[PDB]
Design a protein around this ligand. Structure first.
Ligand code: MG
Ligand code: MG
Ligand code: MG
Ligand code: MG
Ligand code: MG
Ligand code: MG
Lengths: 97, 132, 110, 55, 287, 250
């Protein structure tokens, strides 16, 4: 193998920036806020997986439900083929029956 | 002319339907024990080194438990104070029935005492007399 | 024109006579001229607890921690608590001034 | 729109009378009721005939 | 406690000091080292080793076990069968004892569910509560209760103390409103009518011996007396009782709630109850 | 006039209350202006650091969405044709130039799309972690109860010096009852400070109480927190979400 001959530039992490300092605030908005808002409403991410979790086959199907009709032709073709690949694996292949 | 008529005289029955979120404090009874069998903790409080608290439903927190389908256990929860003192008392209390010292586990972090075998009935009456 | 006072030390050593200093405060706060059995007087009263503890902290300088307030049930506890000295010296600091053997040398790089 | 009245009452702006069935809606309900929910008298009469045949 | 005193001495709790409960997590094993690598737990080469063993229930080519057994209607119509949650007099007494079911006012399925005494699931085909005789010997409460089903001995326990038990049928739609009335008032719809029992259940609810809500009231006193003689207790005249009005209170067979007529709208926000005025709409609901 | 506070809800008969010194930020030396009583079941629960670990994990993992992705051999450009014939070449058999073995081929087992780590702990468990965390700050002498957050000056120098004089930590977390009413003097000074963070009482959480060394609570927030956390201990299970009308719940 070959190795770097010089030390990489020192990496600096500022631990008291606004994002790190105020991380975790409004996570008890429900119990401490009379349950008007669930904390899962505070998650930022893809439309199909806010407040939700699943295996890859489940994630593929759920993305199709939410944005399937707004997807590009090439992407929808790939997404559909991934569903069929994962369907045949999880339902026909593996050690355990 | 609107096809309706507003009233404020029947909103007593709607209020009757609203549900509570807090478990009510048990009502005072003239004579104890109550016909179900429930009896509140005695006052003045017991002076033992340990205190056993009641559940939110105002019952003695003794639970029969089973694992593996054959390991029978009884569990005393919500134990405050010297959890080790409570074990000594239980061992003396249950030894005559068994004829040998009972096997127990003390979980000091959770504050619970775990005993091998089913002894919930004897251990609930026992606690009632101590006033817990 | 708010100017911070000098930072105080966290070291406390029991005064010459706690009973004398303590009883004087109790007499002032209680005002009955030291009724017998004073040591066993309960501090459950909030106003009495504040006056006794607050005054002692100002005089001696050492204050009861928030963790230990509930323990000061009776005057005995307050007297006992002020009997324990408090030292700001670290465990390293003690070694330096501990008459070390001549083959032991320690240096502070901080 | 109804959901807005139940939650917020009058301030929703839903005209109260719009919360009840409309004339044409009412006719549908009654016609459906007759077809599928018989009256008590008819049910007892139907029950009696079955018992007589069984006897 | 002594535990909290230990915290006082110990260093600060912080994100750098965290630890899970011991044995809380198992360690996952990757197929990397010699112990778990190589053939990787799958065995020597073969169908089961490549991952292509047949489906569950296949037995290598003989008619499987779950196919050679005659087909039989154990579960026919299971989704259509009616289910009645069982309530025992022990549970009823226990709920009253701790104040969770108030005996002063009439007891209906709303109050029972409202006190977390029973859990009703209309989606799973619950159509009400059946009273259970268990606990009758120790039952010593005088209460007015409405339950979709009741037993001969369960009725005797209630009446012997001087209480009143009646059996009333609630349709699948009515029950859901009855169980969770407030998640309905918020919709904004008028209160629907209560539909009559199906033809199969009509005899049960029109019979006095079962205390049917559609039964002939004149025939109750005979039924009450016969039950009293059979179980060796003296029937108590409840008219003399001070709280007779509460005991005798009964909702109309087309009514879901005690004080609310079909067709009204409950403006919970304004604490009002909008009521109709139209004639055809009033004739529809009053029918 | 000592500022004396008592728990509004009934303390269990067998447990005596816990107390703390009420403080004021109006001056450097106004350390003890009142004596306060704190519900033992909030500020004197058993020390459970496994639960604090559980809650701290949840606050850091349910929000996580990983955007790592890789192309599989089906999604890599090209690859349809067989490179060479199977037989009569002396070469290794191949069916595509985009298999995982080839340079530039697909990834066999890589990250697949956006993934979520979302889960929810029981509501009682997360409420407990706020009780356990509050005990830890009190018993470790890091919690400072204050009557109000009013400050004589808005210069950030004052707040930092006050923290040093009183032997507070390098980082201080300040809590006020509601965002709308928080005093202007406090907003101006804390806005420019990295280590001193001011949040409303509804934002208090286990993760932020472990990141900040010392906790500063106004007296109204103490009553605010005690009510919410204790309510969890004598409550039924929810019939329907707690935002729907209930007999006795706000
Ligand atoms: Mg694995
Ligand atoms: Mg069920
Ligand atoms: Mg291809
Ligand atoms: Mg081809
Ligand atoms: Mg191929
Ligand atoms: Mg590539």
């Amino acid at each position: 193998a070959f190795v770097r001959l010089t030390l990489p530039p020192p990496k600096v992490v500022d631990r008291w920036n606004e994002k790190r300092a105020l991380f975790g605030v409004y996570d008890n908005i429900g119990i401490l806020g009379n349950f008007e808002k669930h904390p899962k409403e505070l998650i930022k991410g893809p439309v199909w997986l806010r407040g939700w979790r699943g295996n890859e086959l489940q994630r593929c199907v759920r993305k199709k439900k939410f944005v399937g009709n707004r997807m590009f032709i090439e992407d929808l073709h790939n997404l559909n083929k991934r569903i069929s690949y994962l369907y045949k694996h999880f339902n026909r292949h593996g050690k355990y029956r | 002319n609107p096809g309706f008529v507003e009233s404020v005289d029947e909103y007593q029955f709607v209020e009757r339907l609203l549900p509570p979120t807090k478990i009510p404090e048990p009502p005072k009874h003239k004579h104890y024990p109550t016909p179900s069998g429930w009896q509140p903790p005695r006052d003045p409080l017991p002076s033992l080194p340990y205190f056993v608290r009641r559940s939110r439903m105002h019952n003695i927190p003794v639970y029969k438990e089973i694992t593996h389908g054959n390991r029978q256990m009884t569990l005393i929860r919500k134990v405050e104070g010297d959890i080790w003192a409570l074990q000594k008392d239980v061992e003396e209390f249950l030894s005559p029935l068994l004829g040998k010292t009972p096997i127990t586990q003390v979980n000091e972090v959770t504050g619970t005492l775990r005993i091998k075998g089913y002894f919930d009935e004897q251990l609930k009456a026992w606690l009632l007399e101590k006033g817990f | 024109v708010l100017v911070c006072p000098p930072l105080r030390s966290r070291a406390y050593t029991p005064p010459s006579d706690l009973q004398s200093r303590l009883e004087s405060h109790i007499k002032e706060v209680l005002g009955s001229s030291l009724p017998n059995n004073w040591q066993d007087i309960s501090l459950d009263d909030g106003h009495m607890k504040f006056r006794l503890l607050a005054g002692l902290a100002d005089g001696l300088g050492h204050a009861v921690p928030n963790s230990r307030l509930h323990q000061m049930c009776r005057v005995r506890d307050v007297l006992d608590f002020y009997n324990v000295p408090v030292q700001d010296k670290s465990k390293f600091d003690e070694l330096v001034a501990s008459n070390l053997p001549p083959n032991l040398k320690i240096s502070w790089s901080y | 729109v109804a959901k807005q009245f139940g939650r917020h009452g009058a301030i929703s702006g839903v005209p109260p009378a719009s919360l009840w069935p409309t004339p044409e809606q009412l006719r549908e309900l009654e016609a459906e009721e007759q077809e599928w929910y018989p009256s008590l008298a008819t049910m007892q009469e139907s029950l009696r005939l079955q018992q007589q045949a069984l006897e | 406690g002594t535990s909290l005193d230990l915290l006082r001495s110990l260093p600060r709790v912080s994100l750098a000091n965290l630890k899970p409960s011991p044995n809380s997590r198992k360690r996952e094993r990757r197929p990397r080292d010699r112990r778990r690598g190589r053939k990787c737990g799958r065995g020597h080469k073969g169908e089961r080793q490549r991952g292509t063993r047949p489906r569950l229930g296949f037995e290598g080519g003989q008619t499987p076990f779950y196919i050679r057994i005659p087909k039989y209607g154990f579960n026919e119509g299971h989704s259509f069968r009616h289910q009645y949650q069982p309530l025992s007099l022990r549970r009823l007494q226990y709920l009253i004892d701790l104040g969770r079911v108030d005996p002063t006012q009439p007891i209906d399925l709303t109050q029972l569910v409202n006190g977390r005494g029973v859990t009703i699931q209309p989606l799973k085909r619950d159509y009400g509560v059946q009273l259970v005789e268990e606990g009758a010997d120790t039952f010593q409460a005088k209460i007015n209760i409405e339950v979709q089903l009741a037993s001969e001995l369960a009725i005797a326990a209630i009446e012997k103390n001087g209480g009143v038990v009646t059996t009333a049928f609630y349709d699948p739609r009515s029950l859901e409103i009855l169980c969770k009335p407030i998640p309905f008032f918020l919709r904004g719809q008028p209160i629907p009518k209560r539909m009559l029992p199906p033809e199969s259940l009509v005899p049960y609810y029109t019979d006095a011996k079962n205390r049917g809500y559609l039964a002939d009231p004149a025939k109750f006193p005979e039924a009450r007396l016969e039950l009293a003689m059979k179980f060796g207790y003296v029937l108590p005249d409840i008219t003399k009782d001070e709280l007779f009005r509460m005991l005798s209170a009964r909702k109309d067979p087309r009514q879901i709630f005690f004080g609310l007529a079909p067709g009204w709208v409950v403006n919970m926000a304004d604490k009002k109850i909008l009521k109709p005025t139209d004639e055809n709409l009033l004739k529809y609901y009053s029918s | 006039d000592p500022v004396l506070r008592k728990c509004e809800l009934r303390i269990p008969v067998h447990r005596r209350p816990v107390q703390a010194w009420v403080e004021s930020l109006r001056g450097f030396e106004q350390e003890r202006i009142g004596l306060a009583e704190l519900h033992p079941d909030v500020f004197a629960t058993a020390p459970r650091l496994d639960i604090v670990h559980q809650v701290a994990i949840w606050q850091r993992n349910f929000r996580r969405i990983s955007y790592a992705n890789t192309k599989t051999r089906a999604e890599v450009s090209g690859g349809g044709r067989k490179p060479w014939q199977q037989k009569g070449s002396g070469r290794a058999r191949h069916g595509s130039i985009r298999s995982p073995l080839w340079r530039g081929g697909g990834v066999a087992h890589g990250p697949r799309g956006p993934t979520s780590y979302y889960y929810m702990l029981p509501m009682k468990v997360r409420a407990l972690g706020l009780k356990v965390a509050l005990t830890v700050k009190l018993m470790q002498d890091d919690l400072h109860i204050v009557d109000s957050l009013e400050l004589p000056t808005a210069d950030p120098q004052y707040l930092t010096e006050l923290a040093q004089y009183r032997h507070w930590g390098s980082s201080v977390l300040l809590v006020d009852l509601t965002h709308e009413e928080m005093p202007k003097n406090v907003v101006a000074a804390t806005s420019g400070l990295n280590s001193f963070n001011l949040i409303p009482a509804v934002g208090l959480n286990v993760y932020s109480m472990l990141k900040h060394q010392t906790l500063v609570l106004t007296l109204p927030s103490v009553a605010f927190l005690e009510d919410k956390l204790l309510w969890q201990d004598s409550r039924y299970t929810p019939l329907y979400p707690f935002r729907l009308p209930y007999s006795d719940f706000p």
